[PDB]
Amino acid sequence: NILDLFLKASLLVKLIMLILIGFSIASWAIIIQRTRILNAAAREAEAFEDKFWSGIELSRLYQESQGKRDNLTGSEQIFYSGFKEFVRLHRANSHAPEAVVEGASRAMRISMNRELENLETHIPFLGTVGSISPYIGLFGTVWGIMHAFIALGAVKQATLQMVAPGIAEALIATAIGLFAAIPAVMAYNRLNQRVNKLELNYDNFMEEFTAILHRQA
Amino acid sequence: NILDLFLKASLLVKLIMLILIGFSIASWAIIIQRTRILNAAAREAEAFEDKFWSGIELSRLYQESQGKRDNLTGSEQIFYSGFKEFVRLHRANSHAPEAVVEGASRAMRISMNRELENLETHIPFLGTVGSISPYIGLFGTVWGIMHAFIALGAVKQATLQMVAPGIAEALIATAIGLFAAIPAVMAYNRLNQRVNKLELNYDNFMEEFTAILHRQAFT
Amino acid sequence: NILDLFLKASLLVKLIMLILIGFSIASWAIIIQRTRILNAAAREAEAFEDKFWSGIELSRLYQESQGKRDNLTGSEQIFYSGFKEFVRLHRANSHAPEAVVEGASRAMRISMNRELENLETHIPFLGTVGSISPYIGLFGTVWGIMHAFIALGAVKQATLQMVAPGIAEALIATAIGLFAAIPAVMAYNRLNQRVNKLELNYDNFMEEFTAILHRQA
Amino acid sequence: NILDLFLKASLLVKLIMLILIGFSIASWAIIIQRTRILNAAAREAEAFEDKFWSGIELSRLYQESQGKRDNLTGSEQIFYSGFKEFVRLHRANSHAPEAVVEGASRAMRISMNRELENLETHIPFLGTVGSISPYIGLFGTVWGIMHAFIALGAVKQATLQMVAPGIAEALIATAIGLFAAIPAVMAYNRLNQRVNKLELNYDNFMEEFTAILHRQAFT
Amino acid sequence: NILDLFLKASLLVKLIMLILIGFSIASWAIIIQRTRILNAAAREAEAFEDKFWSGIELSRLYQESQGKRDNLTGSEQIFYSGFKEFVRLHRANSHAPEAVVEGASRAMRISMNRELENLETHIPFLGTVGSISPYIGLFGTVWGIMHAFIALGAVKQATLQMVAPGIAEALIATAIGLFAAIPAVMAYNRLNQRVNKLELNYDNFMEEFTAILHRQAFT
Amino acid sequence: QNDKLKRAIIISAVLHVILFAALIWSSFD
Amino acid sequence: SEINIVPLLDVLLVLLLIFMATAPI
Amino acid sequence: SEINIVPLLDVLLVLLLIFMATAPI
């Protein structure tokens, strides 16, 4: 049945099909993995932003952040970095507070870039898979048809009726290639659009905190 | 098999196949060279920052950099350019302790741009190969089929045995085109990723050094 | 007819069909709401702009505006904001004409941006639906073709009659995809054109009002 | 041949073909009508620029300007609006020449926006045809193929001669759809590029006239 | 070969072939002219870059550049557009050394944008040709296939003779489409790379001169 | 990071295996 | 705008699956 | 990103032409 037709096909076609199936498994694994991390980051950032506007004293927030200084992620880390830079540079006899504000902004930008780079990993593999997948299947189909016609022209006793299954096996390659290609192409754009929103949220929080810090000096 | 159909092809098909083989050879050579160059650059960049945070006095690092001016590539060049510019600006006059920041930033940015431009040579050629390769194969295949069907009308009785080899001779071109197309598209993205990561590392170094010099500038 | 084809389909095909039908219903509802809202907005704007140049003094216009200032929208809201800001800046802080002009311009810009943001919404969903719909149909067709080959290989017959049932569901997926795709694109384009026309009308009104105000001072 | 297939096609296929033909006719009419207006406007603008840079006093050409009241277009109306606003607001209030220039510029911007928005009608209709037509053609083809193969499966005997015409009637739809789709987008891309040139010419004239007004205001 | 099947083709095929041949001729002419223009620009820029660091005092270079007045291209226009501006800004406002640098940078950027816009022309036409060319061949292939299906469905047990015209027309259309498509894409990529290289060189020169100016204004 | 990736790989592999098995079994009927 | 002919792949695939088994009756 | 389409369509159409030309039905 299925196994007979699989064995009747040449080795290259089977190898290509197995490669495509493995590609699909890996792509789905990455897609499933990244979504939980992104959602957790979004909810944690929203919760921390909500807690920050309740009117709690900033010293208490700094103490709470310092309690888990090695376990701060997302919007928490940016606040801690900015506050540390602001306080440490303030004891350095800085005559001009504008210098302190600039230093705080610089430290916050550094930490923000590090956190975004941390979040944005493992994505371009999906784009590479989506861009490469169809060509392998097309190559498999072309090779299959080429060898089918070569075998037909080698022996005059052959007929298209006997060679018929080879062409179907060749077309299965293109089918599987498109099957593996499409979801990665969709998910790449979806995840990039989702990351842009977190970038915007971080930027606006950065601006707000910088203004609040500058107004108190 | 393949060689016989290669020999039996017409002039245009042979020229197309030769061009495609040349493109494949060039692509493989470019990949092989750039992989080693980028690996060496990454290893040196990782190694230098380990020394920078060790805790050696700045004068010793500066003299060590001075001793090997001939072999200054990568991150250490940025440090040398920035520190030289800072020293020159301070020696000119001690006024305006804010212009030194902008001057050092300019000096570091110029060297960073030069080095990043240097590391990215010969990569855009690969994208051209990936974009153009399939079309030439299709051109060869359609010309071969046209020639075969034109020659088919010469005989009176029609048999598939006569026309069978021509179709395979035509399809060889498309197969070669796709085989040349895949590796270039594979390699382009990986090389771009490595260059982007190196750029991020250099930006981090620039920001840290600017913060250090800004803190040291004001008493 | 359609019920038999839906029942004979596989599980993934049924899920895809349900998703596409839901998309169609949501798109139709969004179109129905937005058409009425946009038409009402255009009619109100045209009527108010017709009323303005009738020879009615700005003082009595402001007096009438405060009666329904809670529900003032569009051009009426812009006029209210501009006149209020102009009056406030004339009797408070510096009285330089440049400052008054700048403040009035900023207030009008803020109000216009808020109104334009209010009018256009749920349109990016239509754009996303139009962009994504065909790919899901192609995915369903590919899955159906794979299923048809597997079923054909299960049996020992190779007649095209056995293959023929393996194409109906694959074509139905694409038909549903196109049916969901077309109206979304059409409505997207029409609504964008209408919003652009409204934006142009608002901009012309605000420039004329600014020119009128700047002349007296 | 083609007429026989059109007559023997299903009602949906005929309706789709009629819709596509109507779209093609509308697109051709719009393109033909819109092509001449832009050329006429460009010629008028060039002639007016040549007249303006002829060294004639502005008073004489303004005395000739009011004759075509509510009939000016292009740079003539823009110049008339700017000059009238400048003269009126200068002879009314002499507190600040920069205010006079600013008022003139505001009137100029209003008039330019009105002119450009007048010159850009019916162009966005072309994009919808290019975006939509292939979808309708493909829907017709899909429905036709489905019906034909259902009819083929209704009979246990398989032969392609019986079902051959159905595929041709299906493919006519996509042929017509793509034929209507191509020229629309091709001309839509070209027409948009011509508006930018008129915008640039108007902007250059606006800058020149503002400079002249600024020079004359302090006198 | 081409002529025989072209005679055997229909009127639509003839119109398509004429359109595509005209497109190919226009593309070739544009490529031939643009390559020479860019080569001349590159050699002039390289020569000027070589000359700038010959040890000649800047005053002599400025006096020499005054000989050609405003007829300057390449990196020469960048020096003239900006040295005088820096001198006059410093003369007018000697109390704001941080503003003359900003003004010089803005003027140099504007001049560079002007020159870059000047050096890029008729490239979007090549892009349009490359983007639109394949679809006309697709339309031709669809017409050929539907004609072949009509021929098959016309007479039962057809011969290989009456199916020739559709296949011939389809193959001709595809071949001509690809032939018109390929050179446009290749030239597009190459010219974009060369323009990017020239822009990078101009940016490097601007940065170096701005650094020199900032160093000079420090004291 | 590595543990989450390994768990995702395992769950994706088993999901693909069961999906293909279900497809093969259903196509038999 | 843009010309998208994405759903044409299904038509060509379906047609290709049929000429293979069209010879038997 | 982006699934390039023009090569797939051309290859499939050439295959269809080959299959049509070799059928004496």
Numbering used by the authors:
A (entry chain E), C (entry chain A): 5 to 221
B (entry chain D), D (entry chain B), E (entry chain C): 5 to 223
F (entry chain H): 7 to 35
G (entry chain F), H (entry chain G): 14 to 38
What does the paper say about this structure?
The Tol-Pal system is essential for maintaining outer membrane (OM) stability during cell division in Gram-negative bacteria. The inner membrane complex TolQRA harnesses proton motive force (PMF) to establish transient interactions within the periplasm, thereby coordinating cell envelope remodeling and facilitating OM invagination at division sites. The pentameric TolQ encapsulates the dimeric TolR through its N-terminal transmembrane helices at the periplasmic end.
To explore the dynamic motion of the TolQRA complex, we aimed to capture its distinct states using styrene-maleic acid (SMA) polymers. Two distinct structural classes with high resolutions were determined at 2.92 and 3.28 Å, respectively, with one class lacking density for TolA (hereafter TolQ5R2) and the other displaying density corresponding to one copy of TolA (hereafter TolQ5R2A). The TolA molecule bound in TolQ5R2A is positioned consistently with its location on the TolQ1 subunit in the nanodisc TolQ5R2A3 structure. The superimposition of the TolQ5R2 and TolQ5R2A structures onto the TolQ5R2A3 structure shows root-mean-square deviation (RMSD) values of 1.31 and 2.52 Å, respectively, based on the alignment of 217 Cα atoms. When viewed from the cytoplasmic side of the pentamer, TolQ5R2A3 features an oval-shaped cytoplasmic opening, TolQ5R2 presents a round opening, and TolQ5R2A displays a split between TolQ1 and TolQ5 as well as between TolQ3 and TolQ4.
